[PDB]
């Protein structure tokens, strides 16, 4: 297998998959964690 190298695309992919949430909650998360203002990143088991 190939070890791929860590980039903004899977960074925002993990930002997407960490929280399912709701629609207004998703807008709240859009206002809360911008790409500048992500509070926490989890990229384990990739």
């Amino acid at each position: 297998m190939e070890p791929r190298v860590m980039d903004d695309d899977m960074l925002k992919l993990a930002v997407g998959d960490q929280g399912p949430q709701e629609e207004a909650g998703q807008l709240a998360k859009q206002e809360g964690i911008l790409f500048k203002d992500v509070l926490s990143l989890q990229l384990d088991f990739r």
């Binding site: 709701e22 207004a24 909650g25 807008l27 709240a28 998360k29 206002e31 809360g32």
Partner: protein, 221 residues
């Protein structure tokens, strides 16, 4: 019991006490022995664990003054409403006064900024609003004010009422970008609803403590 001062012109009885009481009585000023009357009860801080100084009880409102609390709570005041006429219960213990308004004023926390430390917190229970007035910074005159319309979790049609930004009214001296976030205000609603329930429970506990104090004083007399 140390001193009993009876003023006959105003029909006022004031009892001055000594330290070492189980309920830490210091001053009891009253006109009648019946509950839900005009009375002032003053306590001891070293013997009380909640840090309560004063409780003024009126037939409509109650007022508590504290000191030295870890949550910096200094002032509590609950305005009650008229009782609904229930034909099966006539006791004050069984028919509590419905809480309409609660106002809690908190001491300044130096560990918190002024714009985030809640100086005053008002629950209008009947109209279902929560108002926050934060502490004032030393380089400002007016303080940050926020108003929240606490809506029911279920509407008239069975749907969950989802949060909308038009409901939340916030007057901020400096506009924080993080306080306009919908998530932060939602966590604020969760914390504030929990605090409103806790404050209503504490006001009911204060009323029960008043009833216990009156029963104990009647037993002593």
């Amino acid at each position: 019991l140390e001193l009993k001062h009876i003023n006959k012109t105003t029909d006022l009885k004031t009892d001055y006490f000594k330290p070492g009481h189980p309920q830490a009585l210091r001053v009891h000023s009253y006109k009648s022995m019946q509950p839900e009357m005009d009375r002032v009860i003053e306590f001891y801080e070293t013997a009380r664990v909640d840090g309560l100084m004063k409780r003024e009880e009126t037939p409509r409102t109650m007022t508590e003054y504290y000191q030295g609390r870890p949550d910096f709570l200094s002032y509590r005041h609950a305005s009650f409403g008229p009782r609904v006429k229930k034909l099966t219960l006539s006791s004050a213990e069984s028919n509590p006064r419905p809480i309409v308004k609660i106002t809690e004023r908190f001491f300044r926390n130096p560990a918190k900024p002024a714009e985030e430390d809640v100086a005053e917190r008002v629950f209008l229970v009947a109209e279902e609003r929560i108002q926050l007035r934060y502490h004032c910074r030393e380089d400002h005159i007016t303080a940050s004010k926020r108003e929240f319309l606490r809506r029911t979790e279920v509407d008239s049609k069975g749907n969950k009422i989802i949060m909308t930004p038009d409901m939340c009214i916030s007057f901020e001296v400096e506009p924080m970008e993080h306080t306009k976030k919908l998530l932060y205000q939602y966590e604020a609603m969760m914390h504030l609803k929990r605090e409103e329930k806790l404050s209503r429970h504490q006001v009911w506990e204060s009323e029960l403590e008043v009833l216990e104090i009156l029963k104990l004083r009647e037993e002593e007399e």
